Scaffold this active site. Structure first.
Site, PDB file in Angstrom:
ATOM      1  N   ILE A  65     -29.781  -6.788  43.326  1.00 45.20           N
ATOM      2  CA  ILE A  65     -30.633  -6.997  42.162  1.00 45.20           C
ATOM      3  C   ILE A  65     -30.108  -8.202  41.411  1.00 45.20           C
ATOM      4  CG2 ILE A  65     -31.513  -5.998  40.021  1.00 45.20           C
ATOM      5  CD1 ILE A  65     -31.229  -3.258  41.221  1.00 45.20           C
ATOM      6  N   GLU A  66     -30.975  -9.166  41.098  1.00 45.76           N
ATOM      7  CA  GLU A  66     -30.498 -10.371  40.435  1.00 45.76           C
ATOM      8  C   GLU A  66     -30.103 -10.012  39.004  1.00 45.76           C
ATOM      9  OE1 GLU A  66     -31.878 -12.604  37.852  1.00 45.76           O
ATOM     10  OE2 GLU A  66     -29.856 -13.427  38.063  1.00 45.76           O
ATOM     11  N   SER A  67     -28.918 -10.446  38.592  1.00 48.44           N
ATOM     12  CA  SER A  67     -28.322  -9.983  37.346  1.00 48.44           C
ATOM     13  C   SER A  67     -29.123 -10.280  36.075  1.00 48.44           C
ATOM     14  CB  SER A  67     -26.905 -10.548  37.227  1.00 48.44           C
ATOM     15  OG  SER A  67     -26.260 -10.063  36.058  1.00 48.44           O
ATOM     16  N   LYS A  68     -29.635 -11.499  35.922  1.00 47.10           N
ATOM     17  CA  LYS A  68     -30.390 -11.795  34.703  1.00 47.10           C
ATOM     18  C   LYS A  68     -31.632 -10.925  34.636  1.00 47.10           C
ATOM     19  CE  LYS A  68     -32.945 -15.535  34.214  1.00 47.10           C
ATOM     20  NZ  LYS A  68     -33.277 -16.981  34.058  1.00 47.10           N
ATOM     21  N   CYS A 166     -21.934 -19.827  39.668  1.00 47.43           N
ATOM     22  CA  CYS A 166     -23.224 -19.176  39.694  1.00 47.43           C
ATOM     23  C   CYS A 166     -24.281 -20.265  39.573  1.00 47.43           C
ATOM     24  CB  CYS A 166     -23.299 -18.185  38.541  1.00 47.43           C
ATOM     25  SG  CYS A 166     -24.793 -17.183  38.629  1.00 47.43           S
ATOM     26  N   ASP A 173     -17.982 -18.096  37.595  1.00 43.60           N
ATOM     27  CA  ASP A 173     -17.790 -16.672  37.793  1.00 43.60           C
ATOM     28  C   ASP A 173     -16.304 -16.412  37.951  1.00 43.60           C
ATOM     29  OD1 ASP A 173     -20.545 -16.115  37.708  1.00 43.60           O
ATOM     30  OD2 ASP A 173     -20.747 -16.664  39.800  1.00 43.60           O
ATOM     31  N   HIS A 205     -21.640 -12.877  43.545  1.00 43.32           N
ATOM     32  CA  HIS A 205     -20.414 -12.082  43.692  1.00 43.32           C
ATOM     33  C   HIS A 205     -20.441 -11.285  44.987  1.00 43.32           C
ATOM     34  CE1 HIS A 205     -20.372 -12.041  39.005  1.00 43.32           C
ATOM     35  NE2 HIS A 205     -20.254 -13.252  39.530  1.00 43.32           N
ATOM     36  N   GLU A 206     -21.577 -10.645  45.255  1.00 42.98           N
ATOM     37  CA  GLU A 206     -21.741  -9.811  46.445  1.00 42.98           C
ATOM     38  C   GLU A 206     -21.556 -10.617  47.722  1.00 42.98           C
ATOM     39  OE1 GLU A 206     -23.801 -10.156  43.774  1.00 42.98           O
ATOM     40  OE2 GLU A 206     -24.964  -8.343  43.431  1.00 42.98           O
ATOM     41  N   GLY A 235     -23.994 -11.688  30.883  1.00 45.42           N
ATOM     42  CA  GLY A 235     -25.039 -11.104  30.056  1.00 45.42           C
ATOM     43  C   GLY A 235     -24.948  -9.597  29.910  1.00 45.42           C
TER      44      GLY A 235
HETATM   45  C1  LIG Z   1     -24.311 -15.624  39.338  1.00 45.37           C
HETATM   46  N1  LIG Z   1     -23.201 -15.514  40.214  1.00 45.37           N
HETATM   47  C2  LIG Z   1     -25.373 -14.673  39.489  1.00 45.37           C
HETATM   48  C3  LIG Z   1     -26.584 -14.857  38.857  1.00 45.37           C
HETATM   49  N2  LIG Z   1     -27.379 -13.826  39.155  1.00 45.37           N
HETATM   50  C4  LIG Z   1     -26.673 -12.935  40.003  1.00 45.37           C
HETATM   51  N3  LIG Z   1     -27.108 -11.734  40.558  1.00 45.37           N
HETATM   52  C5  LIG Z   1     -26.256 -11.058  41.329  1.00 45.37           C
HETATM   53  N4  LIG Z   1     -26.722  -9.806  41.895  1.00 45.37           N
HETATM   54  N5  LIG Z   1     -25.025 -11.480  41.613  1.00 45.37           N
HETATM   55  C6  LIG Z   1     -24.572 -12.652  41.067  1.00 45.37           C
HETATM   56  O1  LIG Z   1     -23.350 -13.057  41.326  1.00 45.37           O
HETATM   57  C7  LIG Z   1     -25.437 -13.416  40.231  1.00 45.37           C
END
Ligand SMILES: *[C@H](N)c1c[nH]c2nc(N)[nH]c(=O)c12
Ligand SMILES: *[C@@H](N)c1c[nH]c2nc(N)[nH]c(=O)c12
EC number: 1.7.1.13
Lengths: 259, 261
Positions: A65-68, A166, A173, A205-206, A235
């Protein structure tokens, strides 16, 4: 803005995995453990509630799942009334599972569950204090070539020096990473150089953790391997990817100093 | 190439800008400080090997300027690819640059990560006011919610809430905080206080400014003999701010982090 599951954006695990030359049958098992520090909604009478979410997404899920997008989705709870904490947990399980493509575990914890919880560091030997010169910042997997020539051992190593970028935000990161293995003993200098070479590397990160796992596997050929990274939040959410030959989940989830 | 060390990235904001809106007196009604935690502080040693640390900064509330958070983050990021000969140099530059920005000497601790092993997550002092059976439908800021709020016998109390939320005006993005209020005066009505705090939810102001507004509103509506307002906000871009304002106290006893921080 009211509750809006459409804000969640999946990203397929296959993108990077294809880039790592991985088959549909994975070299690892594991999960992505997320901490949601900012979870907040309204009760049924409109009084704000606050909690910390603990989420586990299986590494076998089609999507991460995309973090933002996850953050924006959580923000949609902020002005929304929910009948009870159980309703919040139910909705999170439903929406996150749908997005990831596999059942996601969710615990919604009151803030008092954290009172007097200690900060932890990682396990085993820290490899960071080495008097060595770094002459460039370019990612190089070949830094691990011939890195495990030692006697058969089982040991746990860690570093606090993992940094990546990122790209979608062009922001740093920050993570610590723990590597537990059974195999030929690894050269500490090579491992540290390899990890430092991520510093200017764009990746999620994953994806970084899967790259570390698969590079160690192919260059060092341990019989058993686990790589667990704990990243600082973006965030209000952090991600802690866990990938292992034999283990499905870590046996501890505890925050580190920078988290 | 990443941007290396760049003090020009720091952005001062004069404190007087918002204080004017509070219609304060010639001499400040409060003293205090803004305590910042810098969770992502990293640079290179002289041989190029990364170093990581957590910083703790105290900016006096009497400083001409506060420091804009995004600019502070960018300034810190400028260290990431820069080589420094020692940790002492890094701490020295931080003191110099942040003091110049603020307009008054700031304190800076640069701590290795091992200093945090076993350190606690803490809550605040006194009684939590959050578990109340009341309905709130109107989230607009209203300071008049405090009108006649302290009817009580004269008491010394410490109260806190985890429900502080405001909006961060550059980004409009939500800010999350807990707030601790210690006072001696007529006992404060807890429903009125909680409604007042919740009314920040849609409100745009900096953390420092919100704490000063809470202090000055409580002072004017409740007239306690002594008051301290201390908020601890979750980080934005790797940095958190913990404004402390008091009629009689200088600073909190520690910087320990709370659950969401
Ligand atoms: C930055 N590394 C970033 C921005 N959106 C992200 N989503 C996820 N799932 N992992 C990340 O590392 C992300
Ligand atoms: C938003 N809350 C925001 C954005 N920049 C900020 N700087 C400072 N010093 N305080 C804040 O609350 C800020």
């Amino acid at each position: 803005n009211q509750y809006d599951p459409s804000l969640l954006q999946p990203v397929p695990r296959s993108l990077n995995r294809n880039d790592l030359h991985l088959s549909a049958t994975l070299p690892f098992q594991g999960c992505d453990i997320w901490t949601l520090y900012e979870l907040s909604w309204l009760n049924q009478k409109g009084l704000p509630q606050v909690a910390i979410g603990e989420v586990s997404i299986p590494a076998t899920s089609a999507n991460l799942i995309e973090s933002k997008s996850f953050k924006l989705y959580l923000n949609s709870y902020n002005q929304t009334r929910f009948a009870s904490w159980d309703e919040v947990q139910t909705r999170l399980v439903h929406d996150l599972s749908a997005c990831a493509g596999e059942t996601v575990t969710v615990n919604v914890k009151s803030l008092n569950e954290y009172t007097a919880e200690p900060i932890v560091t990682m396990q085993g030997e820290c490899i960071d204090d080495q008097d060595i010169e770094i002459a460039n910042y370019e990612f190089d997997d070949a830094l691990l070539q011939g890195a495990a020539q030692g006697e058969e051992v089982s040991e746990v190593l860690h570093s606090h020096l993992l940094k990546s970028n990122c790209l979608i935000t062009n922001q740093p990161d920050w993570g610590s990473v723990e590597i537990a293995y059974h195999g030929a003993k690894m050269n500490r200098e090579a491992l540290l150089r390899y990890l430092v070479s991520f510093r200017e590397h764009n990746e999620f990160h994953e994806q970084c953790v899967e790259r570390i796992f698969t590079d160690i596997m192919r260059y060092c050929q341990p019989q058993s391997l686990t790589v667990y990274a704990r990243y600082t939040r973006l965030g209000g959410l952090d991600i802690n990817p866990f990938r292992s030959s034999h283990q499905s989940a870590p046996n501890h989830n505890q925050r580190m100093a920078r988290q």
